[PDB]
Amino acid sequence: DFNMWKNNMVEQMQEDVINLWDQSLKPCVKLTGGSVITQACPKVSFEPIPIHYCAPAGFAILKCNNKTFNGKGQCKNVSTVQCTHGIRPVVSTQLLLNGSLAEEKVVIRSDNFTDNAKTIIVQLNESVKINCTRPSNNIIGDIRQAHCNISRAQWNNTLKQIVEKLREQFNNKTIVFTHSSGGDPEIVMHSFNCGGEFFYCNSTQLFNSTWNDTEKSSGTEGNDTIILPCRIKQIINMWQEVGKAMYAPPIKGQIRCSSNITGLLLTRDGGKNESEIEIFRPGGGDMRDNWRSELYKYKVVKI
Amino acid sequence: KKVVLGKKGDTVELTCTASQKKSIQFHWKNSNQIKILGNQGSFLTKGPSKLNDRADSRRSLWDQGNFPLIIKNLKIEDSDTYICEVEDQKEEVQLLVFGLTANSDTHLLQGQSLTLTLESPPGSSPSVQCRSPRGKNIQGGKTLSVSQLELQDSGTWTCTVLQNQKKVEFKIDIV
Amino acid sequence: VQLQESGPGLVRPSETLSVTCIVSGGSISNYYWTWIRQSPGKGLEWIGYISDRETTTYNPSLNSRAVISRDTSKNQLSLQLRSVTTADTAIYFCATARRGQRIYGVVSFGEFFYYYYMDVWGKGTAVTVSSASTKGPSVFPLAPSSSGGTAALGCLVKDYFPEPVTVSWNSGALTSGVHTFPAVLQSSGLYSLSSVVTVPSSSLGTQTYICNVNHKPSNTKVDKKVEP
Amino acid sequence: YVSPLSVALGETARISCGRQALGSRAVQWYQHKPGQAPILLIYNNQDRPSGIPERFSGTPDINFGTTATLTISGVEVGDEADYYCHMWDSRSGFSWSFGGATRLTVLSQPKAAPSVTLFPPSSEELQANKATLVCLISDFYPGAVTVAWKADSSPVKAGVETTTPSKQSNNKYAASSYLSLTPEQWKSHKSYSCQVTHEGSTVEKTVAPT
Numbered sequence A: 001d002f003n004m005w006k007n008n009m010v011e012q013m014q015e016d017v018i019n020l021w022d023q024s025l026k027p028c029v030k031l032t033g034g035s036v037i038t039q040a041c042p043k044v045s046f047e048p049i050p051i052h053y054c055a056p057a058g059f060a061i062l063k064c065n066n067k068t069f070n071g072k073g074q075c076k077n078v079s080t081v082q083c084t085h086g087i088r089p090v091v092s093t094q095l096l097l098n099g100s101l102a103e104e105k106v107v108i109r110s111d112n113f114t115d116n117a118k119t120i121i122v123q124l125n126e127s128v129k130i131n132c133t134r135p136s137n138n139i140i141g142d143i144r145q146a147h148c149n150i151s152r153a154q155w156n157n158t159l160k161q162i163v164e165k166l167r168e169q170f171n172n173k174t175i176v177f178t179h180s181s182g183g184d185p186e187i188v189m190h191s192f193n194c195g196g197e198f199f200y201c202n203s204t205q206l207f208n209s210t211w212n213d214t215e216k217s218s219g220t221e222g223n224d225t226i227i228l229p230c231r232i233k234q235i236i237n238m239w240q241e242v243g244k245a246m247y248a249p250p251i252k253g254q255i256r257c258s259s260n261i262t263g264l265l266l267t268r269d270g271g272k273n274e275s276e277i278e279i280f281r282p283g284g285g286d287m288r289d290n291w292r293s294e295l296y297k298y299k300v301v302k303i
Numbered sequence B: 001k002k003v004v005l006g007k008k009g010d011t012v013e014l015t016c017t018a019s020q021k022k023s024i025q026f027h028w029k030n031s032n033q034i035k036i037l038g039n040q041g042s043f044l045t046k047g048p049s050k051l052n053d054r055a056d057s058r059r060s061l062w063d064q065g066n067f068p069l070i071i072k073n074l075k076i077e078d079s080d081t082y083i084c085e086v087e088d089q090k091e092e093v094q095l096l097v098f099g100l101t102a103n104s105d106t107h108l109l110q111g112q113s114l115t116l117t118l119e120s121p122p123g124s125s126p127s128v129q130c131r132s133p134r135g136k137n138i139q140g141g142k143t144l145s146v147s148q149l150e151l152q153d154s155g156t157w158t159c160t161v162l163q164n165q166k167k168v169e170f171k172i173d174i175v
Numbered sequence C: 001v002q003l004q005e006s007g008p009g010l011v012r013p014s015e016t017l018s019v020t021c022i023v024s025g026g027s028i029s030n031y032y033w034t035w036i037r038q039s040p041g042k043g044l045e046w047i048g049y050i051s052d053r054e055t056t057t058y059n060p061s062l063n064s065r066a067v068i069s070r071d072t073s074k075n076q077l078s079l080q081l082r083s084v085t086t087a088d089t090a091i092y093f094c095a096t097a098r099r100g101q102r103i104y105g106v107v108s109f110g111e112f113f114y115y116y117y118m119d120v121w122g123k124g125t126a127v128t129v130s131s132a133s134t135k136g137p138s139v140f141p142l143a144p145s146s147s148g149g150t151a152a153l154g155c156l157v158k159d160y161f162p163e164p165v166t167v168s169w170n171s172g173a174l175t176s177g178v179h180t181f182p183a184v185l186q187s188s189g190l191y192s193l194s195s196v197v198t199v200p201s202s203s204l205g206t207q208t209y210i211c212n213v214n215h216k217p218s219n220t221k222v223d224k225k226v227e228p
Numbered sequence D: 001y002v003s004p005l006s007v008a009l010g011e012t013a014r015i016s017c018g019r020q021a022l023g024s025r026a027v028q029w030y031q032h033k034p035g036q037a038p039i040l041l042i043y044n045n046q047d048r049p050s051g052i053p054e055r056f057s058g059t060p061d062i063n064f065g066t067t068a069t070l071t072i073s074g075v076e077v078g079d080e081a082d083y084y085c086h087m088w089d090s091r092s093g094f095s096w097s098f099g100g101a102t103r104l105t106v107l108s109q110p111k112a113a114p115s116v117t118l119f120p121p122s123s124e125e126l127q128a129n130k131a132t133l134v135c136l137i138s139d140f141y142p143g144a145v146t147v148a149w150k151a152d153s154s155p156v157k158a159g160v161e162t163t164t165p166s167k168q169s170n171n172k173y174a175a176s177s178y179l180s181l182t183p184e185q186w187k188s189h190k191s192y193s194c195q196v197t198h199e200g201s202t203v204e205k206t207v208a209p210t
C-alpha cells in the first residue's frame, strides 16, 4: 500500500534540504517572530548535490517498478533496495528542474484530482531545456536583462502531451493554461536558484493557450524561441519557514545555467462555474511536492 | 453554522484554527467551490475569486495553526458561505454584509423627510431599528422614513440591523 | 554616388546662410544625408542629418537655427542657417550618413544602439560671414621663355575676393603636371593666385594652351590663352 | 582639441581615442587634411572602407575595458593630418561630437631644394599701367624659405608680398612671392632678380624688359 501523498520519507527529505540550505546558503538576516536573526553571510555559489534517503537496518524501503505508477495504489511489482536513487534537490517554485523523467508515457498525479485545491504533479516523457542568465555584472558597462530561454517547439509538444493526459482524467473538456491567480512573487513567478542568485522569471508566456483537442489549440503560435524576462532578488520570502530573509550576492560575473524541465506543478480552478472547460495554472511553494515528485516510487516498512 | 455580519466598506476576519499548533496546508473556498485563498508551504496563494485583490491573511499566526481569511473594504456581493479546509475538517462560516446609507442632501431643511435606505444581500431577512437623538424610534423591514421632520430629530441616529439573532450598528449624522 | 556642394561664399552678418549639395549616380531618396562644417580653429562640427524617410535631427548646439531639406526633383540637399554670425564662417560639407546598429544583447529587450558613419563626402564649400563687397579676378597670361625640352607657362589671377579661385587647363585636358598655387593676400585685402604647368618646348606654337579660371562667388568665368 | 602627436617616418603611430567607452562601443576614425574633405578611415570598430590601406587599424571591441586606438603602421608623409575618433557606446546616448583631433606630424622627411620660376610683367598687364612679377617657389622641404628681390643688385625698397609655405598634393611645400611695380620702374632698370634661400642655400633667377 504505497502512498506518495502520505509518505514520511518526504518530510525527512524536506528537513534534509532545509539543513543543506543552512551552511550552503546562509542568510544575513531572517525576520520571523519578529526574531530578527543575524548571521555572517559570505558570498557563495550554490549548486545542490544529490541526496539519498537511507534505510536504517531493521527497516527497509520498497521500490515500486510500475513504469507508470500513479502513487496511491497497491503496487504489483515491488523491489527492496538499501537506499533511494540519487536525487538532486532543486528548490523551484513553478517548474520542476532536473527531476527524473517518467518512463514511457507522461504521468499526472494528484492525491485528489477532484479537489481543486489539491496540487497536480506532472512528470514528463522527455525533458525540455531551459536556459537562464544574468549577464550584466553588478551598473558597470552594458545594461542587460536577466532572462530565460525555452524552445517554443518543444514546449508546444510537451503541452500537447500534458493536454492528452489531462483530458483523459477530465472527460475531454477543453483545457486552458493561464498564469497564477494571485500569490507571493515566488509562486506567481517561476522562482528558482541559479548560481546562488535568486531568480524570479515570468512564465505567463509559458501558459497562454486553449486546447480543445490534442490538435486544434489557440494561442500557442509564436516566435521559435520563448524568452522569459527575469528579476533577481536578495531580500526574499522564505520557503523553509514563514518569514523574510536577505541573502548575499554571489561570486561576481555572468551566471549561466541550463536546466532540464522534468516536471510541472499545476492546479486547476474548478468550482461551480461550469463552461465545460478546465483552467490550469502553475503553482508550487510547498517543496514537499518537489520531493514527492521523486519519491512516489518508494516506501518505508519495518522488518 | 457560524454567522458573521459585516458593514459595507468595513473589514472582517473570518477565523480558522487547527488542532496542531504548527503551520500546515489550509484553503479558503466559497460556496461555489471557488478557491479564495490558501497557503503553499510558507507562501500565500490567492485563488481566482472576486475577493482576490481584497482578500489577504495574517501569516505571522500561521506558525501556531491560525489561518484567518481577512476581507477588506466589504461589498454586499461578498455575502457568502466561506469554508476553511485544513487538516481534513471543513469549517463553515456565513458572512452577511449590510449597507445603510442616508443618501441625503446634507441639508434636510425643516419638515423634510429621511431618506434612510438599506442595502442587503440575497436571502437575508434583516430587521432595522433606528433610534433618534431624542429617543424616537422608527422601524423598517427594508427602508426607513420619518413622517415629518422636526428640529429635535437632528443629530446622530443609531440604527441596529438584526439578522440571525445577531446585530450590527450604523450611526448617521443628519441635520 | 557622388556629391558636389555650392554656396554664396559670402554672407552678410544678420542674414540667413543657404548652401546646397547635388548628388549623382544614386537617387537622393535612398540615402541618409548630413551636413558637417569646419570653422577655422574649431574642429569638425556636426550640423545635423535628414533620413531616407525625410525625418530630421539637428545638433542641440546650433540652437535650432538649422533647416536641412531634400528636393527630390532637383535631386538636392540644402541646409539653411538662420541669424548667422562671424562664428558661422566655415567650410560646409554634405555627406552620406549610414546607420549601423551595434547589437550587444537581446534585440527584443532593446539591447542595442544605432550609430552613424560618413563614408561619402562632398568637396565642400567655403562660406564667410561678411559685410564685404564681393569681387571677380582679372587674369593675364604668363608666357613661356625662349630646361629642354620642357618649358613653363601659366596664368596670373589678381585681386579676387573671396577665395577660392579654380584653375583648369585646356578645359580639363591638361592634368599633369599642372601646379596651381596658394593665393596671396594683399594689403588691399584681396587674393591673387597663379597657376603654372611644365610641358614640352617642342609642343610650343603648335599645341595651344588655355587656362580656365572659375570664381564661383562672382560668378566670373574666364579663359585665357598662353602664347610665346 | 588639437592635441599634437609626432612620429618617425616609417615607424608606427598609435593614437588613442580621447574618450573612454562606457560599455559596448562602435568607434569611427576619420582622417582630415584641412582644405580637403575628411575621410572615413575606420567604421564599426575595426572595419575598413575600400580604398583604405590595411596599415590603418582600429581595435576591436571583443573584451572588456580595451582602449580604443587607431594604429598607423609604417606612417608615410601623407599621413600628416588631424585624426578624429567618433566614440559611440551603449551608456551615454547619441554622440554629437567628433571630439578633439590628434594632429600627426611626420618626422622628419628627406630634404628637398626649392624649384624656382620667375615671370616678367605680362603684355596686357603692362598695358594696363600695372607691372607685377611672379616668383614661384616649389617642391621644397622643410617649408621655410626666405625670399628677397634683387632689383638689379640693389634690394627693392617696396612692393613685395610673399606667401607662407603651404603644403601640396605631393607632400612638399610651395610658396609664392610677388614684386609689384609701375611699368616705368620696370624698364628703368636692366635686370630684376629674386633670390630664394633654403637651408642657407640660395637659388637666383633674373628677368629683363624686352
Ligand SMILES: *[C@@H]1O[C@H](CO)[C@@H](O[C@@H]2O[C@H](CO)[C@@H](O[C@@H]3O[C@H](CO[C@H]4O[C@H](CO[C@H]5O[C@H](CO)[C@@H](O)[C@H](O)[C@@H]5O[C@H]5O[C@H](CO)[C@@H](O)[C@H](O)[C@@H]5O)[C@@H](O)[C@H](O[C@H]5O[C@H](CO)[C@@H](O)[C@H](O)[C@@H]5O)[C@@H]4O)[C@@H](O)[C@H](O[C@H]4O[C@H](CO)[C@@H](O)[C@H](O)[C@@H]4O[C@H]4O[C@H](CO)[C@@H](O)[C@H](O)[C@@H]4O[C@H]4O[C@H](CO)[C@@H](O)[C@H](O)[C@@H]4O)[C@@H]3O)[C@H](O)[C@H]2NC(C)=O)[C@H](O)[C@H]1NC(C)=O
Binding pocket: A131, A132, A133, A147, A148, A149, A225, A227, C099, C100, C101, C102, C103, C104, C105, C106, C107, C108, D024, D025, D026, D044, D045, D046, D059, D060, D061, D062, D063
Ligand atoms: C536567449 O535567446 C535570445 C534569442 O536568441 C538570445 O539573444 C541573443 O543574445 C546574444 C548575446 O547573449 C546576442 O549576441 C551578440 O549578437 C550581436 C548580433 O549578432 C547578429 O548580427 C551581427 C551583425 O549583423 C550585421 O552585420 C554583419 C557584419 O557585417 C553583417 O554581415 C550582417 O549582414 C548584418 O548587417 C545587416 O543587418 C544589420 C543589422 O544588425 C544592418 O545594420 C546592416 O545594414 C545589414 O542589413 C552578426 O555579425 C552576427 O552573425 C555573426 O554572429 C552570429 C551569431 O551572433 C553568427 O551566427 C554568424 O555566423 C556570425 O558569426 C549575428 O547575425 C553581435 O553583434 C554581438 O557580439 C558582439 O559584441 C560583443 C560584446 O559587445 C562581443 O563580445 C563580440 O565579439 C561582438 O563584437 C564584435 O563584433 C561587433 C560587430 O561586428 C564589432 O563592433 C566588435 O568590434 C567586435 O568585432 C570583432 O568580432 C567580430 C565578430 O565577432 C569580427 O567581425 C570583427 O572583425 C572583430 O574581430 C554578440 O554576438 C544576440 O544579438 C541576441 N540575439 C537576438 C536575436 O536576440 C540570448 O543570447 C539567449 N541567451 C540565453 C538564454 O542563453
Ligand SMILES: *[C@@H]1O[C@H](CO)[C@@H](O)[C@H](O)[C@H]1NC(C)=O
Binding pocket: A098, A127, A260
Ligand atoms: C539533463 O537531461 C539529459 C538527458 O537529456 C541528461 O543527460 C543530463 O544528465 C541531465 N542533466 C542533469 C543535470 O540531470
Ligand SMILES: *[C@@H]1O[C@H](CO)[C@@H](O)[C@H](O)[C@H]1NC(C)=O
Binding pocket: A112, A113, A114, A115
Ligand atoms: C476529492 O475531493 C473532494 C472535495 O470535496 C472530496 O469530496 C473527495 O472525498 C475527495 N476524494 C478522496 C478523498 O478520495
Ligand SMILES: *[C@@H]1O[C@H](CO)[C@@H](O)[C@H](O)[C@H]1NC(C)=O
Binding pocket: A129, A130, A131, A149, A150, A151, A258
Ligand atoms: C540551452 O542550452 C543548452 C546548453 O547550452 C543547449 O543545448 C540548448 O540548445 C539551449 N536551449 C535553448 C537556447 O533554447
Ligand SMILES: *[C@@H]1O[C@H](CO)[C@@H](O)[C@H](O)[C@H]1NC(C)=O
Binding pocket: A152, A153, A156, A157, A160, A217, A220, A221, A222, A223, A224
Ligand atoms: C509551437 O511553436 C512552433 C514553433 O513556432 C510551431 O511551429 C508549432 O505550430 C507550435 N505548436 C503547436 C501549435 O502545437
Ligand SMILES: *[C@@H]1O[C@H](CO)[C@@H](O)[C@H](O)[C@H]1NC(C)=O
Binding pocket: A202, A203, A204, A205, A206, A227, A228, A229
Ligand atoms: C509577465 O506577467 C505579466 C503579469 O505579471 C503579464 O502581464 C505579461 O504578459 C507577462 N510577460 C511575459 C513576457 O510573459
Ligand SMILES: *[C@@H]1O[C@H](CO)[C@@H](O)[C@H](O)[C@H]1NC(C)=O
Binding pocket: A204, A205, A208, A219
Ligand atoms: C497571449 O496571447 C495574446 C493573444 O491571444 C497576446 O496578445 C498576449 O501577448 C499573449 N501573452 C504573452 C505573455 O505572450
Ligand SMILES: *[C@@H]1O[C@H](CO)[C@@H](O)[C@H](O)[C@H]1NC(C)=O
Binding pocket: A047, A048, A090, A092, A097, A098, A192, A193, A194, A195, A257, A258, A259, A260
Ligand atoms: C540542474 O543541473 C544543471 C546541470 O548540472 C545545472 O546547470 C542547474 O543549475 C541545475 N538546475 C537548477 C539548480 O535549477
Ligand SMILES: *[C@@H]1O[C@H](CO)[C@@H](O)[C@H](O)[C@H]1NC(C)=O
Binding pocket: A223, A226, A227, C108
Ligand atoms: C517575437 O519576435 C518579434 C520579431 O520577430 C519581436 O519583436 C518580439 O519581441 C518577439 N516576441 C517575444 C514575446 O519574444
Ligand SMILES: [Cl-]
Binding pocket: A135
Ligand atoms: Cl550574454
